[PDB]
Amino acid sequence: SGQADMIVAPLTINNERAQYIEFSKPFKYQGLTILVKKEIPRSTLDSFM
Amino acid sequence: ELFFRSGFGIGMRKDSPWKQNVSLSILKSHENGFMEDLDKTWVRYQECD
Amino acid sequence: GEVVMKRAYMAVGSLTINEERSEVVDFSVPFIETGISVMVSRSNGTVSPSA
Numbered sequence A: 001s002g003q004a005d006m007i008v009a010p011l012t013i014n015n016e017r018a019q020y021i022e023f024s025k026p027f028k029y030q031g032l033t034i035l036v037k038k039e040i041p042r043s044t045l046d047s048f049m
Numbered sequence B: 001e002l003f004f005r006s007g008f009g010i011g012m013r014k015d016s017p018w019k020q021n022v023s024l025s026i027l028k029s030h031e032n033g034f035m036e037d038l039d040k041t042w043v044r045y046q047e048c049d
Numbered sequence C: 001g002e003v004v005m006k007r008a009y010m011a012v013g014s015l016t017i018n019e020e021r022s023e024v025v026d027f028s029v030p031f032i033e034t035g036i037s038v039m040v041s042r043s044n045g046t047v048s049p050s051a
């Protein structure tokens, strides 16, 4: 819409977006992951018995 | 595992005169090791164990 | 050289995109990420020091 002459952001290269705008060569190669929670180790040993 | 491996690009309009020079200025920064510096100072921290 | 010398339209294969080639040929979007990597033999016995 003319509000910006460029997009400098983590904007992934897509098929739909490529039809309307021209992406540069990627400056960062990556993919999609899943983020989940973590636990600190405890050894879960109740006692010496 | 990584899925949908699509990189980050600098979006511009299809009529832009900078598209040729922007991509070349990104490929050059990849070979010169500049984009590995931006990885070091911003992405590669690793903080805790 | 084939694409530059007009002998072919495309050069599908393991052509890596770099700066000097792209100034004489017109690449496409990468279909797989590559670069430069170092291949070394597997390390021998490496129990963590002072464990």
Ligand SMILES: N[C@@H](CCC(=O)O)C(=O)O
Pocket (backbone or CB within 6 Å): C014, C015, C016
């Ligand atoms: N894959 C490289 C050649 C092999 C190498 O990395 O030396 C290229 O397309 O130019």
